Write a protein that binds this ligand. Sequence first.
Ligand SMILES: NC(=O)C1=CN([C@@H]2O[C@H](COP(=O)(O)OP(=O)(O)OC[C@H]3O[C@@H](n4cnc5c(N)ncnc54)[C@H](OP(=O)(O)O)[C@@H]3O)[C@@H](O)[C@H]2O)C=CC1
Ligand SMILES: NC(=O)C1=CN([C@@H]2O[C@H](COP(=O)(O)OP(=O)(O)OC[C@H]3O[C@@H](n4cnc5c(N)ncnc54)[C@H](OP(=O)(O)O)[C@@H]3O)[C@@H](O)[C@H]2O)C=CC1
Ligand SMILES: CCC(=O)[C@@H](C)C(=O)SCCNC(=O)CCNC(=O)[C@H](O)C(C)(C)CO
Ligand SMILES: CCC(=O)[C@@H](C)C(=O)SCCNC(=O)CCNC(=O)[C@H](O)C(C)(C)CO
Lengths: 477, 477
Amino acid sequence: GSHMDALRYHIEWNRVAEPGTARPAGRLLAVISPDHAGAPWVTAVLDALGPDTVRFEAKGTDRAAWAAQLAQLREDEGEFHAVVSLLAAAEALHTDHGSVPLGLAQTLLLAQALGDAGLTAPLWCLTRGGVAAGRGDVLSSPVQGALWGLGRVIGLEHPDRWGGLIDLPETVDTRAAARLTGLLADAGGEDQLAIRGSGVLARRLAHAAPAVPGSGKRPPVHGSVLVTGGTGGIGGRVARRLAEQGAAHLVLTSRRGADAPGAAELRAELEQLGVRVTIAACDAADREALAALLAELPEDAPLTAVFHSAGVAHDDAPVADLTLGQLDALMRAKLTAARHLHELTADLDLDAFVLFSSGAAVWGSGGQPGYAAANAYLDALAEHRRSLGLTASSVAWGTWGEVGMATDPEVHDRLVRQGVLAMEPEHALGALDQMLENDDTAAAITLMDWEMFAPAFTANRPSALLSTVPEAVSALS
Amino acid sequence: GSHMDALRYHIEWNRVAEPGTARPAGRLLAVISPDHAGAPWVTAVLDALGPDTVRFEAKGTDRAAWAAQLAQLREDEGEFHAVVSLLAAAEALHTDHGSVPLGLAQTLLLAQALGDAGLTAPLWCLTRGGVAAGRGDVLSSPVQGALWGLGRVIGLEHPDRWGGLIDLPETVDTRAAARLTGLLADAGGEDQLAIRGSGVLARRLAHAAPAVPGSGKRPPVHGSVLVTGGTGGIGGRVARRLAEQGAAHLVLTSRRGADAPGAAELRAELEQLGVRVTIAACDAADREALAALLAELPEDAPLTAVFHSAGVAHDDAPVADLTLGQLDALMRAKLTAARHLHELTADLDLDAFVLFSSGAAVWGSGGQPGYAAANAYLDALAEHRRSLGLTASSVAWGTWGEVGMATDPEVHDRLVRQGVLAMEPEHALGALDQMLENDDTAAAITLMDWEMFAPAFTANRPSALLSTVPEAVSALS
Ligand SMILES: NC(=O)C1=CN([C@@H]2O[C@H](COP(=O)(O)OP(=O)(O)OC[C@H]3O[C@@H](n4cnc5c(N)ncnc54)[C@H](OP(=O)(O)O)[C@@H]3O)[C@@H](O)[C@H]2O)C=CC1
Ligand SMILES: NC(=O)C1=CN([C@@H]2O[C@H](COP(=O)(O)OP(=O)(O)OC[C@H]3O[C@@H](n4cnc5c(N)ncnc54)[C@H](OP(=O)(O)O)[C@@H]3O)[C@@H](O)[C@H]2O)C=CC1
Ligand SMILES: CCC(=O)[C@@H](C)C(=O)SCCNC(=O)CCNC(=O)[C@H](O)C(C)(C)CO
Ligand SMILES: CCC(=O)[C@@H](C)C(=O)SCCNC(=O)CCNC(=O)[C@H](O)C(C)(C)CO
């Protein structure tokens, strides 16, 4: 029990100091998405930054054009104190890349083009409702949430020219304005912040509360349960667990379906346990196929739970290199699939709606910006669903042993050297069960060697995020 | 900052497993204080334990009489599963020992007499409002809180016949009753518990969160500040610090007053810093002298803060030996003095009301039951005051270097061997300033060698209290 407790961490938000009252001495550069600069918070922030602030309208998604334009701006206007991006407001999906929110595409390209141009002023990315900071806070935009996953990775890959992320409240009044312009003057080493009516909060990682035997909350597993990526490594083990725990009917999907490696053996394993098994070949981002799958479910085994395990991590790239095509392919199974699952089951009163995220989204991982963004959407969607009165749980895995992506010895070796150790499947699944029995909204379930991880993580830049993990503080002291 | 952060720990409460639904198999022995058995919670608990439970009425405070009565009960009634003491309900002060709550005296004598008689069943001590467990919880009886200090020391000295402490909610309904009788059946290795509407909570020690720079909310030090025991080791250094921070007037008390060792030198030191100095000889348990002291404060320098450093630790004794006279003498400067300070200043809108407690109260110290009880009252009074809308901060010191009680080489050497290391005064006082800038209600400020402390503390019996200190868990693995 306590060994599985030790795997579970959550994100919390702690109150930090009120900022100072002077605006930055040097000039700001504000970056605006010209089709998506009407939102009240975008107006309010532009007003806060004041008329001396240089505006750059980021048109389209043209890296080379922006790099040239930013190079000219630097030449003409000189050096800036910071760059303040309002690109998050662009939530609409990119015309050519249907799983990529325009504001996410534009933020990637902005980070690239700033590098290209030699504009080194720290980049701050603003969002409105991209995080749930505080008890009772509503995460109203899970699309903007995805941007925090990307931003953390820009912090790891370009630490010297990264400012951070700030979430604005719903009403940016003079108190909020002053807190923003104060933070831009000096943020006291914080870089993941939320401005709220009550003050400024910052993001923290903490050990989760221990599991409570007799916890209640979780209904018995029964009826039909959909596992996307259910023929995959983690998905297969999850299916077996659900079969052990009394599911009537497991519906496993993946793009290869019944032709997936080892699907025949998985079906036999599950059917031995007395469970009906359906394996469908089905892109999780295909809305029509999902609708058709749901319409077919037995009347005596209604859908009770979704476990969304569909995902790829390959053909990512460093922030400086990543293409929008690569980004799209990483977002597809995550953002587009999870949005379809959310919309199509919202009326079904599920017992569980479980999304498989990653540490890459929770703390960040160099070389994995597209995977981080994709998985950070899932974490955000879960909070968002809770605000609607719907069940959701996002489980941000560390590293799995035995099955799944991380079983390549080269990947495994890199992960161990960063101190994210491989979990035994029974311990990982037991920790997940603890999470679902608590009915927690979001958790990271990971085996950390903090003595390896904290120094690696903070080599080039401090992390306020880890200040609430005593082992991390000890390792760094 | 981070060195002072490292000194600070907090008591928190985590939800634990729900117990089983069956009564203990064997018979219970309930111990009641016959003049103080009318409180609703005492009725509710008696009703919960059921009519098969043997009742023992603990009359007076006669160790030998009780030992003989318990010896006869054992002979006649046979062996018990546990002994459940309701003696805490007796809050009135002992007629012969004016600083000792009757229930505290009776609980000591019960623990003694059970040992005398050979009645070995684990002893559980129940309280109602003696701890503040959970957000928003009201510690309504700081007198009953004192019993927790004693109980932890009974756990250390008589580990094989100590059950633990359980705090009941204000309304002991059927759900609370079942949690009580379940814990008495089997408590899963827990022994400091609080039963609340939301579940069963257990007591934990944890690192405090690192201070957030720039974020203080402590008002300026100004006016008159009363330091009881202000001529003593810690108290003198505290006085100097308060002078540096802007106090207009330091009022230092102790029983010897101006005849205290070094008092002339301390007065001159403070006068150099530009403050008015009053050194008064008086017992801090003397209500009338405190009143007279407060009445004569300059009109230009009203009382703004109390720092309660008055205390003695000598002429304590093991639980098996401690007399009520010894207990009284250890309680006097803590319970009686702090009650007078609380009552006489409650209407003065103080900025600070700081009570100097001890690790001996927070985790417990073999050989120090009376000192532990006395200091545990202070920690409880602080919570209690907060529930009334009054300021309070209890700081449970570990070991001070350089000045004060622990500078006796023999005491110093014992403490180091237990892993409670001597703090430098500037680091201790700096950690106290962090606490007051956070406006925390209670904290322990201590330098621990956990590799020495954890094994010593747990040699005879596990401590769920330490399960939240990662260094302690590591030392024991
Ligand atoms: N392994 C680990 O340590 C960690 C895993 N995770 C997450 O856990 C989940 C499972 O990972 P894991 O089991 O290790 O990896 P696997 O590759 O073994 O499983 C991924 C599954 O998703 C399927 N899939 C991928 N794209 C799609 C899509 N568009 N539509 C439907 N199915 C798709 C794959 O099958 P097909 O190719 O046939 O579509 C495969 O069955 C992933 O979402 C991953 O991001 C996160 C953190 C760490
Ligand atoms: N030193 C340490 O490491 C720790 C200290 N503490 C607490 O800190 C406080 C200060 O300890 P420290 O400075 O080391 O010890 P000291 O003995 O140096 O100081 C204690 C002071 O309290 C005074 N005092 C004792 N009884 C009374 C009373 N009835 N009325 C008024 N004053 C009285 C003493 O003077 P007089 O005898 O003249 O009255 C003395 O000035 C104590 O309360 C102690 O319990 C707790 C944890 C550890
Ligand atoms: C392939 C299976 C899988 O999901 C893999 C990619 C993962 O689990 S990726 C996440 C593993 N690594 C991380 O989470 C650690 C990221 N942090 C690290 O400590 C890195 O060393 C730093 C220095 C920050 C540079 O990125
Ligand atoms: C005299 C000045 C003073 O306040 C001194 C006595 C103190 O600091 S007392 C508290 C010092 N010691 C402790 O707090 C550790 C007590 N715990 C210990 O670890 C003991 O070895 C055990 C094994 C539990 C038996 O009591």
